[PDB]
Design a protein around this ligand. Structure first.
Ligand code: UY0
Length: 127
């Protein structure tokens, strides 16, 4: 069971903005999670062939990862902060949907999500 194409990261016809909230999502939120010791399983799409998870992309129909989020932010792909926040939440939820409680990967996601939520709590007001 093969891998799907990754999520879209480029679309010239999509309206997009560079806002102070989206800048915070890159400079604070993404950067903080990316450097974390538990980030690496989330820094690129799940390679379900290499990990031998032939059911992964049958169960996870809206895949997301921080490599995709990083590219979207670096490309100014988003219209607003909530679109990007949704991507992070999809990533975390997908982890909890696919895996067992207490699994290492879940503990890793939980550590990243705690930091995510702390940073989002201080999202600046839109300028
Ligand atoms: C983002 C993400 C979400 N869900 C999972 N689920 C998962 C991964 C592998 C699993 O193996 C099961 C045993 N195999 C299956 C057949 C036999 C062998 C089981 C479940 N993976 C993720 N990314 C990831 C990326 C790189 C790696 Cl190396 C890992 N591996 S890991 O074990 O979870 C680790 C980070 C080392 C704790 C996960």
């Amino acid at each position: 069971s093969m891998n799907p194409p990754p999520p879209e990261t480029s679309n010239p016809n999509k309206p997009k903005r560079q806002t102070n909230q989206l800048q915070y999502l890159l400079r604070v939120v993404l950067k903080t999670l990316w450097k974390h010791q538990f980030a690496w399983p989330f820094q690129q799409p799940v390679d379900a062939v290499k990990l031998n998870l032939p059911d992964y992309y049958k169960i996870i129909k809206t895949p997301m990862d921080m490599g995709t989020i990083k590219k979207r932010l670096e490309n100014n792909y988003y219209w607003n902060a909530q679109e990007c926040i949704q991507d992070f939440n999809t990533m975390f939820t997908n982890c909890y949907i696919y895996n067992k409680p207490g699994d290492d990967i879940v503990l890793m996601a939980e550590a990243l999500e705690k930091l995510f939520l702390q940073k989002i709590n201080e999202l600046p007001t839109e300028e």
